[PDB]
Amino acid sequence: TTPGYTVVKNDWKKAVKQLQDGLKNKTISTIKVSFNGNSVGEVTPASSGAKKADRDAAAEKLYNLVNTQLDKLGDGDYVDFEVTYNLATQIITKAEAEAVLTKLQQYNDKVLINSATDTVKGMVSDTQVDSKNVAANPLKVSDMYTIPSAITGSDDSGYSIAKPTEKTTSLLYGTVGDATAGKAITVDTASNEAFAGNGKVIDYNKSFKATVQGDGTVKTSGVVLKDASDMAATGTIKVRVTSAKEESIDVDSSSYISAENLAKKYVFNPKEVSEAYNAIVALQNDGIESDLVQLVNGKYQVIFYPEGKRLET
Amino acid sequence: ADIIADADSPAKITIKANKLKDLKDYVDDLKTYNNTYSNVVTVAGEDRIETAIELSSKYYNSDDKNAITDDAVNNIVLVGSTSIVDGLVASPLASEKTAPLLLTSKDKLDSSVKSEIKRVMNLKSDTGINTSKKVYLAGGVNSISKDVENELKNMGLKVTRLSGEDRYETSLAIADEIGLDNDKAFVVGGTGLADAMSIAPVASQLKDGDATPIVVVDGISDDAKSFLGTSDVDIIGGKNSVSKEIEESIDSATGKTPDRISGDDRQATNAEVLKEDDYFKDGEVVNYFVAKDGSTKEDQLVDALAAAPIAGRFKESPAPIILATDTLSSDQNVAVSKAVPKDGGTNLVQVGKGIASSVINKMKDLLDM
Ligand SMILES: CC(=O)N[C@@H]1[C@@H](O)[C@H](O)[C@@H](CO)O[C@H]1O
């Protein structure tokens, strides 16, 4: 009945590495550690993790504190973490920001609006011939925006991408062979922003697009962001490691242990199994979310921890 | 999203599927098979006397999930290990007195039952056995000898004996102890016992801690006429056992026209008892007991004797006994399928192990377990 996350022993390094990376990018402020239910310390970067050296020191302190305990973990033992986090404060390394910068610069030559025909709308000159619209060359992203060449920042505070500087065009959007003149194309200031981590990524579905409006004019977007994940912005997460072993039951596999041989092997808490069953049905029929049933890697799944083994007969 | 697991659990099981189709199916099968290995059990010793004790061990003064009592008991009912007629009338008595029904050999008190009497009443050398600690002897010196009676007294125990010189008045003696505090009474004949065992778990069902007595007629004695003052009566068995003449003897002596529950076979009347609504409500029977019918040997109905009061006090929904040694009859097959609710059954208890595996499997399918 306690929310959190449970790690099998064999995966402890994987999980610890995650906490370390969290500390290094200013996402985690403090971690409170305890062995078999007893507090044995607390890891916290000095001065709100302002310096890279202090953040790296906390990451090391964590591994040093727990590695021998975890590697020597036996039946019944367990290590509990209490992770206080805030995704807004996340920062990015020099290599991370320079890796995004290159992928942004590939959109420099992308076409926003094509040229118009007599039958489809596109770029048309701002001046007409015989009082009727003629076509113009397509609109590049380089015409409306100037993407930066380099990055800005330091190792202590993090690195950043400046928002591409906005530009104007005097060309228009309309149909070739229409009396009515083409309508203006302008940038959307509310759709061009700088990038420096902060729990976000580049939204390539909405970035560098031309969007027609109700009155017929066109607005263009620049660098648009989106949440890296749908988890809450801040809070404190509990993580446990035990000596249990992990078993994978894929019913779509060629071979897999049947439900009969599973009850043969283990005893399960009856309330826990029916709560899962009921959660599946409420999703199937009514579309009700449930923490018990999740969709991960294109497979819906439930998680059981059995009471123990079933005694032979 | 997830949860903080119990540190003593040995495994982290993740079940995966493309369509929550197949996931629902796997969890549904698990929900049932999990309940099966926990709640489908055999209770048998290697002797009729020894099987009756194993029932006592599991359900009286026990830590079991479905124990009648988890503390010591004050009363005990004792019946001769061969006298089936006696402990059939005695099953209601054991239910009302909150007592296990145990079996003994006529000559001498057996070693095994003697130790179980101590365990179930919590008898110790450092505590005084006071007057509340009693043993009922259902039957005369014919079934349970005078020697055994004195062996019990010499332990420092109280032994009331309900009996007579014949089967008809011993049953009267037992029925007189049982509370005839409401208008029901079951009637059976001296012959046709397998008709009668089917009603033992029903008579053992309690209303305000009152059991329903049964009387054994000849198919009336003047003693039985006074005993059955203006009672609604249900006759269990065929006419072969209770004539329509003695059905009228009851109609006249009481003033009540009695009802009859009967079948062609002993397994048919078993099925008829289940399908009676006053006995078990339709679509609400989740707990079942299985015991030998005596087709191969009439002497094996003894095992149903000790299980009848436990089944009639089981959980909060009573249980019938399905009589079947080698096979189940079609009548029993359909009656069970109608008794069970949509969801399925919750408990199956095999009493004794002279019952064929075929029969237990048929039960499991009928009940979705
Ligand atoms: C297994 C687990 O939950 N790990 C957490 C994750 O939930 C959180 O989002 C992240 C900070 O970004 O810190 C990780 O340690």
Residue numbers in the entry:
A (entry chain A): 3 to 315
B (entry chain B): 1 to 219, 224 to 373
What text comes from the article?
The surfaces of most bacteria and archaea are covered with a proteinaceous coat, the surface or S-layer, which is formed through the self-assembly of individual protein subunits into a regularly spaced, two-dimensional array. In C. difficile, the S-layer largely consists of a major S-layer protein, SlpA, which assembles into a paracrystalline array enveloping the cell. The major protein of the C. difficile S-layer, SlpA, is post-translationally cleaved into two S-layer proteins (SLPs): the high molecular weight (HMW) and low molecular weight (LMW), herein referred to as SLPH and SLPL, respectively. These subunits then form a complex (referred to as H/L) that is incorporated in the S-layer.
